[PDB]
Ligand binder design. Structure first.
Ligand SMILES: Nc1nc2c(ncn2[C@@H]2O[C@H](COP(=O)(O)OP(=O)(O)NP(=O)(O)O)[C@@H](O)[C@H]2O)c(=O)[nH]1
Ligand SMILES: [Mg+2]
Length: 569
């Protein structure tokens, strides 16, 4: 066994500097001493100790680590691909943000993923070299270059930093510029840097070493001789070679003659490796190696790929049915396929699928279907089944996936809501803003079937018909009397029901306050059951009442209570 280098991912919005940061870090190592990796950068502990002064001596872990292994976000902002069985592929993360631009959509996406997988991270506030008036001092520690800036320039920098603190606070994260931090364990450290210059990179590495000191122990243990375990980051064509696999190995050893298993869009497969390629420091872009040991980024050339899925687990095979079962189990634990509750989810990768499923669970939103691939006719059908019993579940959440024609058409039918997008948190805000509305609409239709409070007075001298339909001039004292509303006496005695109302020449379904109309009252009779001048009240049902307006309606609301309480509780 051995202790490997922590894996640090670099996340952030398009062009805030993810790649440039790693390229600079690689440059520092090269021009100071380095093994090259595909899509990653390995910086040795002596190089780190060289860049970070004695600021590292307070971290005993420094003595036991081979160094740090950085991995760039693969593809276009594909943060969710950086995963592995037990959680995130990275042990630590750097959330980079243009100090000048601040948080952008992908910054929020990265933050939510980091929060969700509980991965410790620091925030690198990049591009400080572009703050108006900044004077560059090449590769110097942030404290050193900052102290040489004009006071107002320093002030402008701290202002941008406090806007980051404000945003992070709104996100549930307390934070401060790394040197002002109080409890390293609970506050995010923000390190101002310049990926182009090397400014602040010294403190950046020091803080990452701090996080290793604080959180990493058992997770760094690997068995250098075990069959390699890794994750596929990209599957893509390379001139002269065919389809190729870019992968990170986090445990074990991968050899040139190994057989490896992975998932395809259809099933689990295995292939025999032709070669392992790493970037070359003969005008050949790659250099062949015989093997690489855990803590490596490698490009693999093998024949059975083309349909291999980004995000797929990668495993060297020593026992084929034992490995196929392991990979299948890994898939199943994320897939979800019951009948209970509702909500249909589709994503492009196992990692993006896992992320959405995780976020939805934290939102307490039940899921009936969670699977990979374009929205199918089958998906719509299951959503339909869910549509029943809470139209709330009658939805399909599709992350970075397309909709199969047969599905779109068969979907044209309303009642099934579809959310599509390549930004997870945007999909969730959209689903929730949808649920709010649906709920209001249901609650609205909830009132339409409930009798409200209302009061009316029988204008004396305006009796058009005594018996059978009683008809007389009425003035709505308070509330909104309606056609069909029950009416009772000052003693809770039922007098009759409002049969019809007429405002001058217009027939009304409802009458407001001081309206005054000719009203027909079924089952009532003047000079017996009802009397000229009398005030009548609406006889609201017991329960319909429990579901409790203006000051007038409130008073009456209690006025009705008294009346009913007379011959009751
Ligand atoms: N002035 C300045 N430019 C920087 C800095 N860091 C990166 N850049 C510039 O910003 C642009 C984007 O950098 P890049 O590293 O590709 O960003 P990204 O976040 O990796 N990109 P994408 O999401 O497409 O991968 C480049 O032109 C780069 O030179 C910095 O500290 N200062
Ligand atoms: Mg880039």
């Amino acid at each position: 066994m051995k202790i490997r280098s922590p894996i640090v991912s670099v996340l952030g919005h398009v062009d805030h500097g993810k790649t440039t940061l790693l390229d600079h870090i690689r440059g520092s190592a090269v021009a100071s001493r380095i093994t090259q990796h595909i899509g990653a950068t390995e910086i040795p502990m002596d190089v780190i100790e060289g860049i970070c002064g004695d600021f590292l001596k307070k971290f005993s872990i420094r003595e036991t680590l081979p160094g740090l292994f950085f991995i760039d976000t693969p593809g276009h902002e594909a943060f969710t691909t950086l995963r592995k069985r037990g959680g995130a592929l990275a042990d630590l993360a750097i959330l980079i943000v243009d100090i000048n631009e601040g948080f952008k959509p992908q910054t929020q996406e990265a933050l939510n993923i980091l929060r969700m997988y509980r991965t410790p991270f620091v925030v690198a506030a990049n591009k400080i070299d572009r703050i108006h008036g900044w004077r560059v001092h090449e590769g110097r520690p942030f404290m050193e270059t900052f102290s040489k800036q004009d006071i107002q320039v320093q002030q402008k920098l701290d202002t941008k930093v406090y806007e980051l603190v404000g945003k992070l606070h709104e996100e549930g994260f307390e934070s401060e510029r790394f040197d002002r931090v109080t409890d390293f364990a609970s506050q995010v450290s923000i390190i101002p840097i310049s990926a182009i210059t090397g400014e602040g990179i010294p403190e950046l590495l020091t803080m990452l070493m701090g996080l290793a000191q604080q959180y990493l122990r058992e997770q760094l243990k690997i068995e250098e001789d075990s069959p390699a375990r890794g994750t596929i980051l990209e599957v893509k064509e390379e001139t002269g070679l065919g389809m190729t696999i870019d992968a990170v190995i986090y445990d074990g050893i991968l050899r040139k003659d190994d057989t490896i298993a992975m998932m395809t869009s259809k099933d689990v497969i295995s292939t025999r490796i032709r070669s392992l390629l790493k970037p070359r420091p003969s005008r050949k872009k790659f250099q062949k190696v015989d093997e690489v040991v855990a803590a490596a980024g490698i490009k693999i050339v093998a024949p059975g790929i083309d349909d291999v899925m980004a995000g797929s687990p990668l495993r060297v095979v020593t026992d084929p049915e034992k490995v196929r079962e392991e990979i299948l189990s890994e898939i199943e634990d994320i897939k979800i396929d019951t009948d209970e509750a509702g909500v249909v989810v589709k994503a492009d990768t196992l990692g993006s699928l896992e992320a959405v499923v995780k976020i939805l669970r934290d939102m307490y939103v039940p899921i009936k279907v969670a699977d990979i691939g374009d929205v199918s006719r089958r998906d719509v059908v299951n959503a339909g089944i869910a549509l029943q019993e809470d139209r709330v579940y009658g939805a399909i959440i599709a992350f970075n996936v397309k909709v199969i024609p047969s599905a779109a058409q068969e979907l044209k039918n309303s009642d099934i809501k579809l959310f599509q997008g390549n930004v997870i948190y945007r999909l969730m805000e959209e689903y929730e803003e949808w649920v709010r509305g649906i709920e209001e609409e249901k609650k609205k239709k909830w009132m339409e079937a409930i009798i409200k409070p209302a009061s009316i007075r029988l204008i004396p001298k305006l009796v058009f018909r005594q018996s059978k339909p009683a008809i007389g001039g009425v003035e709505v004292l308070t509330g909104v009397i309606r056609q069909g509303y029950p009416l009772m006496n000052d003693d809770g005695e039922t007098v009759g029901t409002v049969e019809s109302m007429q405002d001058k020449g217009e027939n009304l379904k409802s009458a407001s306050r001081g309206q005054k109309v000719a009203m027909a009252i079924k089952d009532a009779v003047y000079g017996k059951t009802i009397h000229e001048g009398d005030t009548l009240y609406v006889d609201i049902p017991e329960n319909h009442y429990h579901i409790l307006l203006t000051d007038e309606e409130l008073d009456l609301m209690d006025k009705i209570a008294e009346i009913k309480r007379k011959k009751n509780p």
